[PDB]
C-alpha cells in the first residue's frame, strides 16, 4: 500500500493549519470582558481536521475529517465540548491507524471499498433534537446535541430519497420546514438533482427530481415563499476522468453560471427553468425573497473567475492564490420570463466578502441585515509579514466582519486586529422580542500571535467592540460552517418575525 | 465572598505555565523517528493544573488540581488520554464554577468546609489494578488505569490507619509490598507519623505510630531490606499561625535535617532513632540500601538552603529564585550507632540535580544506575534570553537528564536543546531479561519555541540521542511525578533482578 506518514507534512497542515485532533472538554473557559448573562444556548461549528496523515500529498482542506465544537453558554459562563464525527471513514481509519480514503470525492483512489465517503465536515445543523453533520456527497450523520455522540448515518426514518444531502438546507421560519436538496443524486457524475423538504413533524413533503444542464457543483441554494433556486458553479465532473485517478472537479470557461428556478410546491422536473447568468463562481447565498412584483431577489457572493483555483480547467488554466475576489451580488430572476440570459448583477458593497449570515427569522422573506466575512487588503489591517509564515495554506482568509443595513446602507466593520483572522459568524437574537438583526454576533478568531483560538462576542448596537473575548488555550483549526441553537427555542430554530 | 477572577493572571500562570485544562483524548500522536515496537505499556504522569482561577493571588504551583496524562504505547503507536482527578475540591468548585479552596494546606482560608482537601497532584502510581493519585495531606484517590475515571477517596478496604498517605510509597520488587507512611497523620500540625505497609494481596502488614521531633515536612522516604528512613525537611508547621491566615510551612534555621531510622518489621514507635544531619533541604530519594557492613546508604538530592524559598523563615529570611542548588548526596547511617550527629555527606556528581529515578527492579537493594534531571547554568546550554520571558514561574527547571553508572563512574548527558526543558524521566526495562539500567528512558519536554510539549524516547545504550520524538500539539504544563506500567508485568511492577 502507499506509505502512511507518521507526522503531517505540507503547507496544508503547517503552522496554524497543523491538526490538533483533540476530543473532549474544556469547561469554564477564560473570559476577558463579560458575556451577557441573558445569552443561553450553544454555538456549534465544524472544522475539517485530518485524524491521520493522508497518503495523498497536499490533500485539500475540504477532505479532512469533521470535528464538531460546541460552545455551551449559560449565565455568562461557557464550556467547550469537542468531538469527531464517527463517519465510516473515521472509524475504519482509526481501526487501521492509517489513512484509507484517497482523493476528494474519488472512490477509485480509495484503498478499501467505502459504502459512505462522508467526512461530515462542512456544516452542523439542528433538526428535531439531533445535530446533522453535513457533507454534500453523502447523507447527514446524526449526533447528540448534548454529548456530541455520533448516532450514525441518518435517513429520516427511511424517507431520504437521494444519495446526497446538501450542506446548506434552509429553515423556513413560518412553515418550520427544512428545505433540502442533493446534486449528483444518483451517484458520481449524475446530473440528477433531488429537491425535497421535511415538515416540522419529520414527514417528507416535497420530492422532485430534475436534471442539471451539466454535472456541475451546486454547493448552496436559495428558497423563497414560492420558489427554490439552484446556482451552479462551473466546476464540472467527468466520471471517466475520475476512473483514471483524476479530479472530481474541473473548471469550464465555456458555460454560464446556470441558475435554476423551480416552483417550491407541487412541481415536476420539467418545470425547472435554467437561467444563464454571466459566467462566474456561485458563492454562498445570504438569502433570497420575492419582492412586491413577484420577482426573485437572490443575494449571494459572486466572483468572476474560479475561487477553487486548485481545480483548474482542462488545460490547467486558472487563477492564483488570493487573486480572485467575491462580491455581494443581487441577481433578479422572473420565473415567468422566457429570456434565459440574465443581466450582470448589482453589487451591494465593494468589499471582498464571503460567509454571509442573516437573521434567520426572516429566511425566505425580505431581509434587511446581512453579516459577512471580509478580506480587506488595505495596508495594515492584516500584518501579512507576520501572519503568512505562521498560517499555512488551503483555507480562506477573512480579517473582519461587516454588518450591512440594507435600508440605511450603513456598514459597520469589526476588525479583530492585525494578527488575527476570523471564521464564519453567527447571529443571536437579543431575546424573542428583538428587532431584525438586533442581538449578539459570535465569531471564532485565529490569533497568530498566541497560536490560539478565541471566541469573540459582539453586540450589534456596536459591532466594532468586543463585549467579551473567550480565550481558548488550544487551536481550533480554521473551519467551515456553524450555527446557534438557542435554549428558548423548542425546535432549535428562532421564531418568525 | 472574595471575587473569583474569570481569567488567569500572575507569573505562576503565564506563558508555558498558563493552564490549558483539557480532558479527553488525542490518539495516534505524531512521531518523528521511530518508537521501538517492543515497548508496550503506559506512561502515567500528573501535573498541577488549576481548573478555576484562584481567589488567592500567586497560589503556589503545588496547589493546582491534579490532571492525569496517560501515554498508551503499542507496536510503535502512542495515544494520549488526559483527565482530572475528581477530588472533592474539583467537584465542588466545578459545581460552583469558582474557586473555594484557599491557601496551600490552610483550611482556615477555605470558603466552605472541606472533608478532603487533596488536589491529588503529586504522584500517580499503580496498585492492584487501580491508579492511586497521591497528595501528602490526604488519602489517595483511586482511578481506572484504562479510562482515567475517578472511583473516589481510597482507604484500602477500610484498613488505612492514617489521615495521610505519602506521595512516595516504595514498591519492594522481592516481597511485592507497597511500603507507605503519612506525616501529620492525625491532622494539621500533628507530629504523628504512621508507617504502614500492604502485602501484594492487599492486606495491611505493618502499622507503627511514631513521633516526629518537630512538625516538619517529610516529602519522601527510603526503604531498605530491614529499615525505613524518614528525612525531615526543616519546614515547620504552626497551626496558630495558620488560624491567622499564615502559611502552613515556615523554614527553621535553628534545627538539623533530622533523619529517622525505624526497623522495617515488628517495631514500636520508641524504636525510632532521630539522627541529625547537617542543616539543609531533604530532596528526593533516589534509593537506599544496606551494604556489606549492615550500614544504610541513603542516596538523595540535598541542598544547603531552603529550595521552597516562597515559604521563608519567621523573619522572611530565605534564598532567591534560582540561587539554591541540590546535589546528589550519599549519607551513611547505622541504626546501631548512638551518635546522633551525622557527617556531611559525600556527593556522587557535581551537577545541580533533582528527580532521581533508578531501575526499580533493585529498589531497596544495591543499585548502580541512577537517572536524574540536571540544571546546567553553563552559558549556551539553555537560551535563557529566549526561554525565561515565555516560561512563567513556580516550577523547577531542568535542561537535561544524566545517567550515572555507579560502578564505572561514567555519566551520559541528554540535552534536548537550548530552547527546551525537561520533566521527570521514567525508565523502562528493555524486556524481562534486561540488565540493570538497560532499556529506554522517556521524558516530557517543554518546547519554548513551539509552545508545545513533546515526549522524547531514548535508548540507554546512548542517552545523547533521541530514538523518537512524540510531538504533542498542546502544552502539558510542567508537572510532578510519573510512572511506567509495563504490559508484561501483571501487577504493574517489574520483576526483581
Ligand atoms: Co458552504
Ligand atoms: Co516528590
Phi–psi pair at A187, nearest 5 degrees: 130, 175
Of all ligands present, the nearest one to the C-alpha of A122 is 1
Chain Cα centroid distance, residue B323: 21
C-alpha cell at B441: 528512558
| CA distances to A29, A481, B137, B485 from A473, in Å | 9, 22, 31, 30
Residue B433: CB atoms within 10 A of its CB come to 7
Torsional class of B178: left (φ above 0), alpha (ψ -120 to 50), beta (otherwise): beta
Query: What are the beta bridge partners of residue A361?
Result: none
With CB atoms and an 8 Å threshold, state whether B22 touches A21.
no
Q: Integer distance in angstroms from the first to the last C-alpha of chain A? A: 57
Q: Measured between beta carbons, which residues in chain B are less than 8 angstroms from residue A21? A: 26-28, 473
Measured distance CA(B224)–CA(B227) in Å, rounded? 5
Measured distance CA(B272)–CA(A487) in Å, rounded? 65
- Does residue A22 sit at the B interface (CB-CB below 8 Å)? yes
C-alpha cell at B274: 532521630
A 76-115 → B contacts, CB under 8 A: 77, 82, 94, 97
C-alpha cell at B112: 466552605
Q: Measured between beta carbons, which residues in chain A are less than 8 angstroms from residue B471? A: 7
Chain Cα centroid distance, residue B192: 22
- Select from A420, A438, A435 the least CA-distant residue to A478: A420
- Select from B434, B414, B268 the least CA-distant residue to B362: B434
C-alpha cell at A184: 449528483
In the DSSP assignment, the letter for residue A317 is: -
CB-CB: which of B7, B82, B475 is closest to A30?
A: B7
C-alpha cell at A479: 473551519
With CB atoms and an 8 Å threshold, state whether B473 touches A475.
yes
Dist. CA B25 → ligand 2 center (Å): 27
The method of structure determination was X-ray
CB-CB: which of B8, B30, B474 is closest to A8?
A: B30
Helix residue spans in A173-283 (DSSP H): 239-243
Measured distance CA(A223)–CA(A178) in Å, rounded? 10
CA nearest A8 in B: which residue? B30
Measured distance CA(A145)–CA(A312) in Å, rounded? 39
Residues B14-24, buried b or exposed e (16+ Cβ, 10 A)? bbbbbbbbbbb
Secondary structure in 3-state letters for chain B: CCCCCCCCCCHHHCHHHCCCCCEEEECCCEEEECCCCCCCEEEEEEEECCCCCCCCCCCCHHHCCEEEEEEEEECCEEEEEEEECCCHHHHHHHHHCCCCCCCCCCHHHCCCCCCCCCCCCCEEEEECCEEEEECCCCCCEEECCCCCCEEEECCCCCCCCCCCCCCCCEECCCCCCEEEEEECCCCCCCCEEEEEEECCCCCEEEEEEEECCCCEECCCCEECCCEEEEECEEEECCHHHHHCCCCCCEECCCCCEEEEEEECCCCCHHHCEEEEECCCEEEEEEEEEECCCCCEEEEEEEECCCCCCCCCECCCCCCCCCCCCEEEEEEEECCCCCCCECCCCEECCCCCEEEEEECHHHCCCCCCEEEEEECCCCCCCCCHHHHHHHHCCCCCCCCEEEEEECCCCCEEEECCCCCEEEEEEEEEECCCCCCCCCEEEEEEEEECCCCEEEEEEEECCEEEEEEEEEECCCCCCCCCCEEEEECCCCCCCCCCC
Measured distance CA(A272)–CA(A221) in Å, rounded? 14
CB-CB: which of A7, A30, A473 is closest to B471?
A: A7
Dist. CA A63 → ligand 2 center (Å): 47
Measured distance CA(A296)–CA(A292) in Å, rounded? 10
Q: Measured between beta carbons, which residues in chain A are less than 8 angstroms from residue B19? A: 473
- Select from B123, B45, B140, B125 the least CA-distant residue to B86: B140
Phi–psi pair at A388, nearest 5 degrees: -55, -45
Q: Measured between beta carbons, which residues in chain A are less than 8 angstroms from residue B26? A: 20-23
Q: How many residues does chain A have?
A: 497
Contact present, B234 and B257 (Cβ < 8 Å): yes
Q: Is A89 helix (H, G, I), strand (E, B) or coil?
A: helix
- Does residue A474 sit at the B interface (CB-CB below 8 Å)? yes
Contact present, A330 and A303 (Cβ < 8 Å): no
Give the residue carrying C-alpha cell 413577484.
A294
Of all ligands present, the nearest one to the C-alpha of A48 is 1
- Does residue A451 sit at the B interface (CB-CB below 8 Å)? yes
Measured distance CA(A138)–CA(A162) in Å, rounded? 9
The dihedral through the CA atoms of B453, B458, B464, B465 has a sign that is: negative
CB-CB: which of B6, B31, B474 is closest to A30?
A: B6
- Select from B433, B423, B413 the least CA-distant residue to B478: B423
Chain Cα centroid distance, residue B14: 23
Give the residue carrying C-alpha cell 548526596.
B329
Give the residue carrying C-alpha cell 496551600.
B104
| Pairs of CB atoms within 8 A across A/B | 76
Measured distance CA(A93)–CA(A85) in Å, rounded? 13
Contact present, B171 and B360 (Cβ < 8 Å): yes
C-alpha cell at B316: 522572611
Measured distance CA(A147)–CA(A70) in Å, rounded? 9
With CB atoms and an 8 Å threshold, state whether B23 touches A26.
yes
Contacts of A444 (CB under 8 A, 6+ apart): A45, A422, A423, A453, A454, A455, A456, A476, A479, A482
Q: Is A141 helix (H, G, I), strand (E, B) or coil?
A: strand
Measured distance CA(B318)–CA(B302) in Å, rounded? 16
Q: Measured between beta carbons, which residues in chain B are less than 8 angstroms from residue A78? A: none
| CA distances to A126, B423, B441 from B482, in Å | 43, 9, 12
With CB atoms and an 8 Å threshold, state whether A24 touches B25.
yes
Contacts of B240 (CB under 8 A, 6+ apart): none
Measured distance CA(A346)–CA(B223) in Å, rounded? 85
With CB atoms and an 8 Å threshold, state whether B28 touches A52.
yes
Measured distance CA(A450)–CA(A15) in Å, rounded? 12
Measured distance CA(B1)–CA(A342) in Å, rounded? 67
- Select from B67, B73, B74 the least CA-distant residue to B50: B67
In the DSSP assignment, the letter for residue A140 is: P
Q: Measured between beta carbons, which residues in chain B are less than 8 angstroms from residue A52? A: 28
Q: β-strand B222-223 against B439-447: which pairing, if any?
A: unpaired
Measured distance CA(B353)–CA(B407) in Å, rounded? 20
C-alpha cell at B303: 541542598
- Does residue A475 sit at the B interface (CB-CB below 8 Å)? yes
Q: Measured between beta carbons, which residues in chain A are less than 8 angstroms from residue B94? A: 27-28
With CB atoms and an 8 Å threshold, state whether A94 touches B27.
yes
Residue B407, burial from CB neighbour count under 10 angstroms (0-12, 13-18, 19+) = exposed
- Select from B103, B25, B97, B16 the least CA-distant residue to B57: B103
Residue A291, burial from CB neighbour count under 10 angstroms (0-12, 13-18, 19+) = exposed
Measured distance CA(A280)–CA(A127) in Å, rounded? 33
With CB atoms and an 8 Å threshold, state whether A25 touches B25.
no
CA nearest A17 in B: which residue? B473
3-state DSSP helix/strand/coil % of chain A, to nearest 5: 10, 40, 55
Query: What are the beta bridge partners of residue A74?
Result: A77
CA B27, B119, B19, B67: dihedral to nearest 10 degrees?
A: 0
Q: Is A15 helix (H, G, I), strand (E, B) or coil?
A: helix
Q: β-strand A66-74 against B41-48: which pairing, if any?
A: unpaired
Residue A490, burial from CB neighbour count under 10 angstroms (0-12, 13-18, 19+) = exposed
- Select from B212, B423, B365, B219 the least CA-distant residue to B302: B219
Dist. CA A424 → ligand 1 center (Å): 10
Binding residues of B for piceatannol, as ranges, are 104, 135, 354
C-alpha cell at B121: 497532584
Measured distance CA(B231)–CA(A339) in Å, rounded? 95
- Does residue A32 sit at the B interface (CB-CB below 8 Å)? yes
Measured distance CA(A160)–CA(A171) in Å, rounded? 17
Q: Measured between beta carbons, which residues in chain B are less than 8 angstroms from residue A19? A: 473
C-alpha cell at B162: 492514617
Give the helix/strand (H/E) hosting A414.
strand A411-414
Query: What are the beta bridge partners of residue A183?
Result: A193
Chain Cα centroid distance, residue B294: 28
Measured distance CA(B288)–CA(B299) in Å, rounded? 6
Phi–psi pair at B41, nearest 5 degrees: 155, -170
CB-CB: which of B7, B23, B475 is closest to A31?
A: B7
| CA distances to B176, B348, B464 from B369, in Å | 21, 12, 16
Q: β-strand B346-347 against B326-333: which pairing, if any?
A: antiparallel
Measured distance CA(B358)–CA(B380) in Å, rounded? 29
The annotation status of A51 as a binding-site residue, yes or no, is no
Residue B343, burial from CB neighbour count under 10 angstroms (0-12, 13-18, 19+) = exposed
Residue A413: CB atoms within 10 A of its CB come to 14
CA nearest A99 in B: which residue? B28
| CA distances to A25, A475, B472 from A68, in Å | 12, 14, 20
Residue A491: CB atoms within 10 A of its CB come to 14
Measured distance CA(B412)–CA(B404) in Å, rounded? 7
- Select from B89, B85, B237 the least CA-distant residue to B148: B85
Sheet of A250-251, strand order: A216-217, A233-236, A250-251
Measured distance CA(B106)–CA(A21) in Å, rounded? 40
| CA distances to B44, B130, B192, B490 from B68, in Å | 7, 13, 30, 22
In the DSSP assignment, the letter for residue A313 is: B
Measured distance CA(A27)–CA(B94) in Å, rounded? 9
Rg (CA), chain A: 21
CA B371, B372, B377, B383: dihedral to nearest 10 degrees?
A: 90
Measured distance CA(B318)–CA(B321) in Å, rounded? 10
Measured distance CA(A9)–CA(B444) in Å, rounded? 23
In the DSSP assignment, the letter for residue A264 is: S
C-alpha cell at A41: 444556548
Q: Is A201 helix (H, G, I), strand (E, B) or coil?
A: coil
Give the residue carrying C-alpha cell 477573512.
A398
Residue B349: CB atoms within 10 A of its CB come to 14
- Select from B217, B214, B227 the least CA-distant residue to B294: B227
- Select from B8, B15, B9 the least CA-distant residue to B392: B15
Taking the CA of residue B204 as centre, how many other CA atoms within 13 Å lie in the half-sphere pointing to its CB?
16
Q: How many residues does chain B have?
A: 497
- Select from A472, A469, A473 the least CA-distant residue to A33: A469
Give the residue carrying C-alpha cell 448552496.
A220
Q: Measured between beta carbons, which residues in chain B are less than 8 angstroms from residue A24? A: 22-25, 82
Contact present, A180 and A164 (Cβ < 8 Å): no
Q: Is A447 helix (H, G, I), strand (E, B) or coil?
A: strand
CA nearest A14 in B: which residue? B473
Measured distance CA(B131)–CA(B134) in Å, rounded? 9
Measured distance CA(B323)–CA(A69) in Å, rounded? 46
**Max CA separation in chain A (angstroms):** 62
Give the residue carrying C-alpha cell 438546507.
A169
Q: Concatenated DSSP letters for A458-485?
A: EETTEEEEEEEEEE-SS-------EEEE
Residue B56: CB atoms within 10 A of its CB come to 16
Most B CBs within 10 A among A28, A455, A469, hence the mutation to make, goes to: A28
| CA distances to B157, B159, B166 from B152, in Å | 13, 16, 17
CA A200, A202, A203, A204: dihedral to nearest 10 degrees?
A: 90
Dist. CA B480 → ligand 2 center (Å): 7
Q: What stretches of A244-377 adopt beta strand conformation (E)?
A: 250-251, 257-263, 273-277, 281-290, 296-303, 326-333, 346-347, 353-358, 369-374
CB-CB: which of B22, B30, B94 is closest to A7?
A: B30
Contact present, A231 and A222 (Cβ < 8 Å): yes
Amino acid at each position: 500500500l502507499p506509505p502512511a506518514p507518521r507526522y503531517f507534512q505540507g503547507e496544508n497542515t503547517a503552522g496554524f493549519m497543523r491538526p490538533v485532533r483533540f476530543e473532549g472538554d474544556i469547561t469554564n473557559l477564560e473570559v476577558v470582558g463579560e458575556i451577557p448573562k441573558s445569552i443561553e444556548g450553544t454555538f456549534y461549528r465544524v472544522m475539517p481536521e485530518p485524524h491521520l496523515p493522508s497518503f495523498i500529498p497536499n490533500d485539500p482542506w475540504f477532505n479532512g475529517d469533521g470535528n464538531i465544537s460546541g460552545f455551551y453558554f449559560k449565565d455568562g459562563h461557557v464550556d467547550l465540548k469537542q468531538r469527531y464525527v464517527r463517519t465510516e471513514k473515521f472509524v475504519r481509519e482509526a481501526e487501521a491507524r492509517r489513512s484509507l480514503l484517497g482523493k476528494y470525492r474519488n472512490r477509485y483512489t480509495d484503498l478499501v471499498e467505502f459504502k459512505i465517503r462522508s467526512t461530515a465536515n462542512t456544516n452542523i445543523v439542528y433538526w428535531r433534537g439531533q445535530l446533522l453533520a453535513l457533507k454534500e456527497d453523502s447523507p447527514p450523520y446524526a449526533m447528540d446535541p448534548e454529548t456530541l455522540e455520533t448516532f450514525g448515518v441518518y435517513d429520516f426514518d427511511g424517507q431520504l430519497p437521494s444519495l446526497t444531502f446538501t450542506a446548506h438546507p434552509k429553515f423556513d421560519p413560518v412553515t418550520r420546514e427544512m428545505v433540502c436538496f442533493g446534486y449528483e443524486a444518483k451517484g458520481d457524475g449524475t446530473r440528477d438533482i433531488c429537491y425535497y423538504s421535511f415538515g416540522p413533524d419529520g414527514k417528507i413533503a416535497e420530492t422532485v427530481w430534475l436534471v442539471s444542464p451539466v454535472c456541475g457543483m451546486i454547493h448552496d441554494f436559495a428558497v423563497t415563499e414560492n420558489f427554490v433556486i439552484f446556482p451552479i458553479i462551473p466546476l464540472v465532473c467527468d466520471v471517466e476522468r475520475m476512473k483514471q485517478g483524476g479530479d472530481h472537479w474541473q473548471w469550464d470557461y465555456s458555460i454560464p453560471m446556470y441558475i435554476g428556478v423551480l416552483p417550491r410546491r407541487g412541481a415536476q422536473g420539467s418545470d425547472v427553468k435554467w437561467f444563464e447568468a454571466p459566467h462566474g463562481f456561485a458563492g454562498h447565498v445570504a438569502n433570497a425573497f420575492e419582492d412586491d412584483k413577484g420577482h426573485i431577489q437572490l443575494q449571494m457572493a459572486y466572483a468572476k473567475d474560479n475561487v477553487f483555483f486548485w481545480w483548474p480547467d482542462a488545460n490547467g488554466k486558472g487563477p492564483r492564490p488570493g487573486e480572485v475576489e467575491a462580491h455581494f451580488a443581487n441577481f433578479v430572476l422572473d420565473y415567468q420570463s422566457d429570456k434565459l440570459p440574465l443581466a450582470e448583477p448589482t453589487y451591494l458593497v465593494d468589499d471582498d466578502m464571503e460567509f454571509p449570515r442573516i437573521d434567520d427569522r426572516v429566511a425566505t422573506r425580505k431581509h434587511k441585515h446581512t453579516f459577512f466575512c471580509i478580506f480587506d487588503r488595505k495596508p495594515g489591517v492584516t500584518d501579512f509579514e507576520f501572519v503568512m509564515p505562521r498560517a499555512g495554506g488551503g483555507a480562506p482568509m477573512s480579517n473582519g466582519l461587516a454588518h450591512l443595513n440594507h435600508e440605511t446602507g450603513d456598514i459597520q466593520r469589526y476588525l479583530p486586529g492585525p494578527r488575527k483572522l476570523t471564521g464564519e459568524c453567527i447571529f443571536i437574537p437579543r431575546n424573542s422580542e428583538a428587532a431584525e438583526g438586533d442581538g449578539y454576533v459570535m465569531v471564532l478568531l485565529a490569533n497568530y500571535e498566541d497560536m490560539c483560538s478565541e471566541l469573540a462576542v459582539l453586540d450589534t448596537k456596536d459591532l466594532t467592540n468586543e463585549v467579551a473575548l473567550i480565550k481558548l488555550p488550544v487551536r481550533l483549526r480554521p473551519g467551515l460552517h456553524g450555527n446557534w441553537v438557542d435554549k428558548s427555542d423548542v425546535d432549535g430554530h428562532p421564531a418568525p418575525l
